[PDB]
Design a protein around this ligand. Structure first.
Ligand SMILES: Nc1ncnc2c1ncn2[C@@H]1O[C@H](COP(=O)(O)OP(=O)(O)OP(O)(O)=S)[C@@H](O)[C@H]1O
Ligand SMILES: Nc1ncnc2c1ncn2[C@@H]1O[C@H](COP(=O)(O)OP(=O)(O)OP(O)(O)=S)[C@@H](O)[C@H]1O
Ligand SMILES: [Mg+2]
Ligand SMILES: [Mg+2]
Lengths: 452, 452
């Protein structure tokens, strides 16, 4: 009804991700009656749009065993699009792909220990030879070579984000092996799926921020000026910074983060200048989001603030808020856990004149949050998260994250007999049997707290 | 149950330290059925792991009079491993010891007064000649030469921390005699055994700090993010700083101390820069512990703080806390006796989101504390510490330390007839008879105080 901005919306090209029968990294499969509909011939380079900004460029081929409303893609493409099997993706015609002449690829450290020989010769040359492969910047692809398979990241391309790897292309692979930990931080960058119990608030954010930015026509046509300052407020640990991360990763807009304490940490004037820089940067990068996390740090009530520099910074901000003309296409978001400690002038019409209440999650909220927190956890057959959701009345998402963390530590405490701190590494078998039982959660629950 | 992380755990190589029959510094003895089990042949150079980070390298030989679950080692090796007889040690196969070509050894000043002659010629050369001795950097070893025995410290070695002293090795011994007081300060560096009444809290510290740092595989495998800010709190003199010292000396992690007043003593900006430096240093030295002692000095409630520089520092800290990415492998520890006077933003999720309560000790705690405080004290036959533990309900560790100090001063007061302040030194006999009686404790007890 109001949640309408979030509805899936059936389209010709919106397709469910199915497992590939064509196991090659550069290839996606569609049914023959689906290829006809989208006017995609055999062998055409296509653009795929996954979750959290992520894209892949692939060749499209027909498949009989594939369904009409499905798309067949292997683990590697699915990984690049940040999608599990049975997620919706956009398939888009992509005939504008120039042949690249310089690509920079790097291996991943843990997939490359022992005998270098020559990485390009053993792995990359047979992977690209006459293949005319489409690849995007930031693609992590796997290659097999005798003994084992090595993962590579596309660090740099010749045309801007994507190119066809012709026999012309110089494939540079000199450099530092990409640390596995970097790409784990990248896979586990926060998106809208990582934020739970905030469905109606997320709808609000897309309405107030995403919609006026990526569709300013609506507002101009309907004769209405889009709101330009959105303040997220709520109790400690409710998801504001998480939403800030999710928005940063999921928007079409250029995004600029300002941390409250980050600003206040810097020298007198050198902080006013960083604020100035942020607003000018956002203005410069046409459609933009400025997120001021912990706004209360930078904009407290000009009465209850003793320092002149501090009083000056509130004035510096207000000026910038009012400084953005209509045709700037910059929405400013901010987050606080003490909204009533922000100078009221900032909360007036034209400034942060819209509020999103990221409040305490209900029983259904808590369930969502526990499901998001355990998606990477090994859980036992007997673990009932609905039971946990129900036993946690006072809990915000931060409390639940901590709750899941403690139940896991308890599962570790149970496995302390076969583990010792003095050992160099932990026994192989011991690591696999690690499952967080319901009994672990009941311990975590017994120890649990609200921020009371 | 929860104390599980601390449990000794029986292992093939975990062995009880027994007095040596082979009196040589380079040699440890095991029983024949123990040598078979660990696949250690006669003469093999081994790696021994004691308490408080300490190691020793020795040659292993069979012994008949030695038990299976016991290891025979002399006073010197026991000293180097910082163990008294009947402590558990790790013995490790060590076939990777290259012959050293330069060692720097220095004598200890109090074992070297009068006639130098030549230290290398009289002591070192007969000690190492054709002996193929394993030695570690920091080893304090004793050598006998005619008139008396001299103590030597291994200051520097040729391969990194340990080498075999072949006839190739240049034995440098030029330089300042090592001060005895330095090596007393090193022997009496604080460890986990020096902290009593904190068993469950010590378990917590190893869980939250040692375990994630020296075994981050578990947390990744279980799909759980390790906590990254641990705050120890409790009343004045409970043993927070002591724990900080113990952790500093006992961890495998790099350890950076920050004292609160230390920081706030330094010029405006020059303190922000010192905080900066501490975090960059920890980040640089891969797996690290930052200890912020007396946090309340640097992070008070941004409201109840008048100084702009002081307000700026809290902001500088928060920034750094949030600034460490997941792949940093840096846990920040902090201590305070006023946890409620710290800015709550610091005590939020992701910051100091974990609390260790170093509280008042129970009866059994006080007994532990008194046993630690009197381990170097001359006590009378009639001194019953269980009696002292029970008479001290209000007392924390600092109170008990002072109680032991006052009991000792009372023993000195009883000996005031044969002592005079005007004398150049105290009579020899008078010094030896100095024993602290139970009557001394009852005087100390009578005068005693909590911090009420
Ligand atoms: N609604 C939620 N859904 C999923 N995870 C959540 C939610 N709320 C909190 N979490 C988890 O708790 C952590 C902390 O939440 P944050 O977004 O940092 O808190 P916050 O709302 O910014 O609170 P303040 O005001 O900074 S204390 C996140 O990293 C998530 O892992
Ligand atoms: N739990 C303990 N076990 C053994 N000795 C202790 C213990 N607590 C205190 N002590 C002794 O008392 C002295 C003072 O303790 P500290 O660790 O400095 O106190 P603290 O807990 O840091 O208190 P604050 O907050 O600085 S007043 C130490 O040097 C120890 O000798
Ligand atoms: Mg936040
Ligand atoms: Mg202290």
């Amino acid at each position: 009804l109001s949640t309408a901005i979030l509805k899936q919306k059936n389209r010709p090209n919106r397709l469910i991700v199915d497992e590939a029968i064509n196991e090659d990294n550069s290839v996606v499969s569609l049914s023959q009656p689906k290829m006809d509909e989208l006017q995609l011939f055999r062998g055409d380079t296509v653009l795929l749009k996954g979750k959290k900004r992520r894209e892949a460029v692939c060749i499209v081929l027909s498949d009989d065993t594939c369904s009409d409303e499905k798309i067949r893609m292997n683990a590697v493409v699915r990984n690049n699009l940040r999608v599990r099997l049975g997620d919706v993706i956009s398939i888009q015609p992509c005939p504008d792909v120039k042949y690249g002449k310089r690509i920079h690829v790097l291996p991943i450290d843990d997939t490359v220990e022992g005998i270098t020989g020559n990485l390009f010769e053993v792995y990359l040359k047979p992977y690209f030879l006459e293949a005319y492969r489409p690849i995007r910047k930031g693609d992590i692809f796997l290659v097999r070579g005798g003994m084992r398979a090595v993962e590579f990241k596309v660090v740099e391309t010749d045309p801007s984000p994507y190119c066809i790897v012709a026999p012309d292309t110089v494939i540079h692979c000199e450099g530092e092996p990409i640390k596995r930990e970097d790409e784990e931080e990248s896979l586990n960058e926060v998106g809208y799926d990582d934020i739970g119990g905030c469905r109606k608030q997320l709808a609000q954010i897309k309405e107030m921020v995403e919609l006026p930015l990526r569709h300013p026509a609506l507002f101009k046509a309907i004769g209405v000026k889009p709101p330009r300052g959105i303040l997220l407020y709520g109790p400690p640990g409710t998801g504001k910074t998480l939403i800030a991360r999710a928005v940063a990763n999921e928007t079409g807009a250029f995004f600029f983060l300002i941390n409250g304490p980050e600003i206040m940490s810097k020298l007198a004037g050198e902080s006013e200048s960083n604020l100035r820089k942020a607003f000018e940067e956002a203005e410069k990068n046409a459609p933009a989001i400025i997120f001021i996390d912990e706004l209360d740090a930078i904009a407290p009530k000009r009465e209850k603030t003793h320092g002149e520099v501090e009083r000056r910074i509130v004035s510096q901000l207000l000026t910038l808020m009012d400084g953005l003309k209509q045709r700037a296409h910059v929405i400013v978001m901010a987050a606080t856990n003490r909204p009533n400690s922000i100078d009221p002038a900032l909360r007036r019409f034209g400034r942060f004149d819209r509020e999103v209440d990221i409040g305490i999650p209900d029983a259904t909220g808590r369930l969502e949050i526990l499901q998001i927190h355990t998606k990477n956890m090994k859980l036992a057959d007997d673990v009932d998260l609905e039971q946990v959701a129900n036993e946690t009345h006072g809990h915000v998402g931060a409390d639940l994250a901590a709750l899941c963390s403690e139940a896991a530590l308890q599962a570790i405490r149970k496995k302390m007999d076969l583990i010792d701190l003095e050992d160099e590494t932990i026994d192989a078998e011991v690591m696999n049997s690690l499952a967080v039982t319901m009994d672990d959660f009941r311990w975590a629950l017994s120890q649990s707290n609200p921020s009371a």
